[PDB]
Amino acid sequence: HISSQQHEKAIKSYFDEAQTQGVIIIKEGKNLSTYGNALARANKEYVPASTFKMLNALIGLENHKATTNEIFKWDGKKRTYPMWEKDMTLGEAMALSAVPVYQELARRTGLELMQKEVKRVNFGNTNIGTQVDNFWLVGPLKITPVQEVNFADDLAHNRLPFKLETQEEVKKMLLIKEVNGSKIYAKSGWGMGVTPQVGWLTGWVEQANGKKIPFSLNLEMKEGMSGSIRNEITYKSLENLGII
Numbered sequence: 001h002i003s004s005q006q007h008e009k010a011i012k013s014y015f016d017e018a019q020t021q022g023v024i025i026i027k028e029g030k031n032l033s034t035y036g037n038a039l040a041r042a043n044k045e046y047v048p049a050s051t052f053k054m055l056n057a058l059i060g061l062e063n064h065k066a067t068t069n070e071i072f073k074w075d076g077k078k079r080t081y082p083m084w085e086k087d088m089t090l091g092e093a094m095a096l097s098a099v100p101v102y103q104e105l106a107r108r109t110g111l112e113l114m115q116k117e118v119k120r121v122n123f124g125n126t127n128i129g130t131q132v133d134n135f136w137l138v139g140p141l142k143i144t145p146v147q148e149v150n151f152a153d154d155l156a157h158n159r160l161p162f163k164l165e166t167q168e169e170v171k172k173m174l175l176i177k178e179v180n181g182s183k184i185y186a187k188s189g190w191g192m193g194v195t196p197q198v199g200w201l202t203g204w205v206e207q208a209n210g211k212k213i214p215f216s217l218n219l220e221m222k223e224g225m226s227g228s229i230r231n232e233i234t235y236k237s238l239e240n241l242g243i244i
């Protein structure tokens with residue numbers, strides 16, 4: 001019996017109190033709902049940042065450029081983050097957002113095939129440019145929050161144009177939280193190489209009864225913010241709406 005005005009005010013306040021500007025899009029069946037404190041972001045284009053790892057993984061697995069148990073060895077060079085200085089499967093690299101592993105996968109796929117596959121899936125503006133190893137971080141590839149929640153909807157329902165097994169393999173890599181009987185599958189993104197910086201958390205809730213509710217959070221990341229604010233705003237929003 002909570003009013004829509006109250007849900008909208010509560011979710012807006014989560015973004016306001018984080019001192020940022022953002023939106024979260026929820027999809028139930030075919031119907032989109034937009035909440036947050038900067039609703040016009042819903043149809044604006046931003047780099048996908050590490051949310052692209054979901055599609056990179058699907059492309060690399062479908063095209064036999066990796067397997068799910070393959071261990072990508074750390075080459076022993078210093079990484080931006082100490083946690084990336086280790087050997088990882090694609091799933092472990094998904095959880096750590098380990099850019100170097102997914103850059104290796106993108107190089108295995110190669111520019112020609114990557115561009116064909118990104119165009120085949122019709123992801124965002126579909127443009128990868130000439131640099132196979134950073135096009136999701138600094139452009140030219142861009143996508144809107146509406147497009148990201150629709151991509152999440154497709155993956156959650158096995159509707160992307162990849163084998164069912166490929167989609168199930170990647171979905172297994174995305175489980176980030178279990179709340180009561182709900183499961184949250186999602187991938188974060190933080191585009192630190194663009195100005196202003198973009199933050200994402202895109203995925204879906206699988207409820208105990210089997211319904212899947214996709215979402216995409218998009219906000220501006222600011223100096224000194226914690227990445228966990230993306231998760232915190234998302235979970236508070238999903239809980240306020242009774243989705244978890």
Ligand SMILES: *[B]([O])([O])[C]([C][C])[N]S(=O)(=O)[C]C1=[C][C]=[C]C(C([O])=O)=[C]1
Pocket residue numbers: 049050051079080097098099100137188189190191192193
């Ligand atoms: B993603 O989560 O959006 C990815 C990993 C956090 N984001 S990022 O590429 O912008 C983080 C980063 C910043 C500077 C340099 C590197 C690197 O060494 O690849 C990564």
